[PDB]
């Protein structure tokens, strides 16, 4: 089949069926074939989960047209001090990775068309948070467990990106009341879901008032572990005409009985109230409102890519073809 | 039912782990690792500052926590 005139489309078609290690060895000619291999049509969905990345190895792969880069729980700390070109990756996933801050800056300072990011449990820095404001097309930003950014960087990030559908700014320690106030007084009005959870002594009723007034189109709202909600903030959620999955879990100041008050809202579908409903009264509360799924759906689907009971390997509905098996 | 392990003081970190009673261990995420709002939901009751950092594949039922010191 090999020739000096074999059609490029035909051998691209035969290449498309090859797996990743076989493709790495698809460079039979050690010459002409080498080029037809690194074609952008091949590297389009890289499922390089786990494993490891050498210096300028992830950069080279990202250079040749990769758009879905699933690289969670990986070790890519080795510095990449080499010139690159703007990557076109549009669906990244570096959840819980062990990347170094310097190389994180080096890589992330090139992606400008991103629209799906997930940096869960990673240590960031100001330059990195600022450079995330140069790609406004983000519709999903996951940021749980992060730390290391000042209030100004968060303000810039949340003011420049004005299209976010789902934000998961949860449990980001090294947060002061100023951080929460900036994150709530600057979040985009177009958001439909938010996860401002884990801020016990920083969330006050004024912040909730600002959130409900500014953003009217929420569909989910998870203010988990908010010890300063008392019993007068239900009229705040009554102003939300589209809220569907409010989860006021572990709010100790909330009285149990007045949870019945939350049954008046028509749009409400589920209500995770774990930690504050005592035994026995939970059954009565469920019986009172048969239309609510009290105490279900333990985990959060808010901007998390791989949500599912079964082991899944598609990030936000995108399944990769090139995988490391 | 649940068991809480002792602290394995490391440099710049302090660890522990918790084993579930297998009636909650089937309610464990296998793709992502949970947060202080989701493992407090299962029933784990520890102090403030414990974060899940790795899930051991041979034993999915054991949760591993670390904490800055």
């Amino acid at each position: 089949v090999s020739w000096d005139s074999l059609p490029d489309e035909l051998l691209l078609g035969i290449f498309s069926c090859l797996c990743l290690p076989e493709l790495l060895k698809v460079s039979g000619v050690c010459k002409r074939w080498y080029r037809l291999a690194s074609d952008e049509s091949l590297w389009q969905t890289l499922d390089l989960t786990g494993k490891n990345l050498h210096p300028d190895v992830t950069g080279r792969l990202l250079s040749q047209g990769v758009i879905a880069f699933r690289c969670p729980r990986s070790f890519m700390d080795q510095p990449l001090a080499e010139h690159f070109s703007p990557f076109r990756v549009q669906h990244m996933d570096l959840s819980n990775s062990v990347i170094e801050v310097s190389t994180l800056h080096g890589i992330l300072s090139q992606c400008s068309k991103l629209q799906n990011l997930s940096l869960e449990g990673l240590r960031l820095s100001d330059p990195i948070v600022n450079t995330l404001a140069k790609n406004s097309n983000l519709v999903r930003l996951n940021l749980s467990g992060c730390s290391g950014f000042s209030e100004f960087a968060l303000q810039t990030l949340l003011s420049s990106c004005s299209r976010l559908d789902e934000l998961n700014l949860s449990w980001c320690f090294d947060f002061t009341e100023k951080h929460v106030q900036v994150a709530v007084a600057h979040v985009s009005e177009t958001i439909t879901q938010l996860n401002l959870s884990g801020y016990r002594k920083n969330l006050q009723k004024s912040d909730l008032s600002t959130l409900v007034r500014r953003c009217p189109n929420l569909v989910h709202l998870d203010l988990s572990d908010s010890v300063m909600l008392k019993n007068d903030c239900f009229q705040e959620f009554f102003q939300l005409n589209y809220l569907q999955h409010l989860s006021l879990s572990r709010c100790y100041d909330i009285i149990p009985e007045t949870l019945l008050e939350l049954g008046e809202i028509p749009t409400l579908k589920t209500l995770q109230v774990f930690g504050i409903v005592p035994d026995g009264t939970l059954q009565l509360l469920k019986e009172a409102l048969p239309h609510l799924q009290i105490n279900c759906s333990h985990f959060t689907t808010i901007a998390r890519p791989t949500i599912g009971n079964k082991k899944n390997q598609e990030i936000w509905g995108i399944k990769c073809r090139l995988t490391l098996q | 039912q649940i068991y809480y392990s002792d602290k394995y003081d490391d440099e710049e970190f302090e660890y522990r782990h918790v084993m579930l009673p297998k009636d909650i261990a089937k309610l464990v995420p296998k793709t992502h690792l949970m947060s202080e709002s989701e493992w407090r939901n299962l029933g784990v009751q520890q102090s403030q500052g414990w974060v899940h950092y790795m899930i051991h594949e041979p034993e999915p039922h054991i949760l591993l926590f670390r904490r800055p010191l």
């Binding site: 100790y252 930690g275 504050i276 | 809480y4 009751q45 520890q46 102090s47 403030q48």
Partner: peptide
């Protein structure tokens, strides 16, 4: 609610 953020000495 009685200082729940305490490891249970059981």
């Amino acid at each position: 609610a009685g200082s729940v953020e305490q490891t249970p000495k059981k």
